């Protein structure tokens, strides 16, 4: 119900700790990892925060 | 000037009773009249009031601004306060000296039954 | 008389204003009176030529937006700090 696909497209090696925690909150683990999350403003805020290294499919 | 220095002279004990939450008897003194009012601890509403400007008090008196009028006022405001169930207050001199008409008022209210 | 052609800004802010001054334009605003303020954009080389005269800053100017003439006056202008260019102009409805 209003769920979207989020796909990690870049690495998280040199990234900030807050961005690594945001990717953990989305549940992304490795590159090309496509995950399925609900569409809330909190989810959209994490995607906004790491939009450079994810790809939202909706 | 004189009004302002009286307010500066009163505004320490007024703020102290403001934070004590004290129901407070407020005296106001003129050369001709003397005023009294019992104020709630919020300071925004009154409970009872008495004066020498009222007819029921002034018509029994010689002059409205002597010690006998001030004692009649403190008696009337105490009997109205005890009618309304207000017994314990704190006396606000309102920047006057506790002396003369103010003291005779507070002694009348103590004698009529208020406790301060 | 100076007749200036303008267009209503579809978007505002810093990125838009930088991007207009990139594309040889500059924003302005018409305000005053009871009407709401109107966020316009002008051609830079035209208005930069028109402002060299003191008539520009004295007379009443006609601004055409959507074929709708608005008689204004030049209230204030923000200039580039070291280039002969215009950042932004305030127009008060006369």
């Amino acid at each position: 119900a209003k769920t979207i696909k989020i796909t990690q497209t870049r690495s998280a090696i040199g990234r900030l700790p807050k961005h690594k925690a945001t990717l953990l909150g989305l549940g992304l683990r490795r590159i090309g990892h496509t995950v399925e999350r609900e569409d809330t403003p909190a989810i959209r805020g994490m995607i906004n925060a790491v939009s450079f290294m994810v790809k939202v499919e909706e | 000037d004189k009004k302002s220095a009286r307010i500066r002279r009163a505004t320490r004990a007024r703020r102290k009773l403001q934070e004590l939450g004290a129901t407070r008897l407020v005296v106001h003194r003129t050369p001709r009249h003397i005023y009294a009012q019992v104020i709630a601890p919020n300071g925004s509403e009154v409970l009872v009031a008495a004066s020498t400007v009222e007819k029921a008090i002034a018509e029994q008196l010689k002059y409205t601004g002597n010690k006998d009028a001030a004692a009649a006022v403190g008696k009337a405001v105490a009997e109205r306060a005890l009618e309304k169930g207000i017994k314990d207050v704190s006396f606000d001199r309102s920047g006057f000296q506790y002396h003369g008409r103010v003291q005779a008022l507070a002694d009348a209210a103590r004698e009529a039954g208020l406790q301060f | 008389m100076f007749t200036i052609n303008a267009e209503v800004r579809k978007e505002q802010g810093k990125g838009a204003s930088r991007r207009l001054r990139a594309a040889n334009k500059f924003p302005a605003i018409i305000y005053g009176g009871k009407e709401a303020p109107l966020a316009i954009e002008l051609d830079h080389d035209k208005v930069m030529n028109m402002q060299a005269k003191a008539e520009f800053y004295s007379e009443v100017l006609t601004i055409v937006v959507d074929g709708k003439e608005i008689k204004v006056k030049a209230q204030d202008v923000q200039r580039h700090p070291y280039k002969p260019k215009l950042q932004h102009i305030d127009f008060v409805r006369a």
């Binding site: - | - | 800053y57 030049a74 200039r79 700090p81 070291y82």
Partner: protein, 136 residues
């Protein structure tokens, strides 16, 4: 050579020189010498460009100096190791942002102000330009 008479403190941090300037418009006179680059102007560079335009106008017209050197600059002496306190105050500078009007001038023609400010800008490390009094 311009220099403050008194100072609240004798020395100052090195700081930075980022940002745009404030003395942008030609306030007092008719013609102006506007800074385009960024940097610091010493009191010697200011007084040399003042001499070059005072002589180029034959004391005709009036010349304003919009800047003032108020930042002390320290240097350590030669063959002194890097510790043991901050260096000694040697000279005074004025921090210059782009857009700062450095000088103003009136009472002279435009072409004379061009050749005077050109003789002055040849004494200055930063790149300048010529400006006039704009209405508004």
């Amino acid at each position: 050579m311009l220099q403050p008479k008194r100072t609240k403190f004798r020395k100052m941090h090195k700081g930075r020189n980022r940002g745009l300037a404030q003395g942008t418009d030609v306030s007092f006179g008719s013609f102006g010498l506007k800074a385009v680059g960024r940097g610091r102007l010493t009191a010697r560079q200011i007084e040399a460009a003042r001499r070059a335009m005072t002589r180029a106008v034959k004391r005709q017209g009036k010349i304003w100096i919009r800047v003032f050197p108020d930042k002390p600059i320290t240097e350590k002496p030669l063959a002194v190791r890097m510790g043991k306190g901050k260096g000694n105050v040697e000279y005074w500078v004025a921090l210059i942002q782009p857009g700062k009007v450095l000088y103003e001038m009136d009472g002279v023609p435009e072409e004379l102000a061009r050749e005077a400010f050109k003789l002055a800008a040849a004494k200055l490390p930063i790149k300048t330009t010529f400006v006039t009094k704009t209405v508004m």
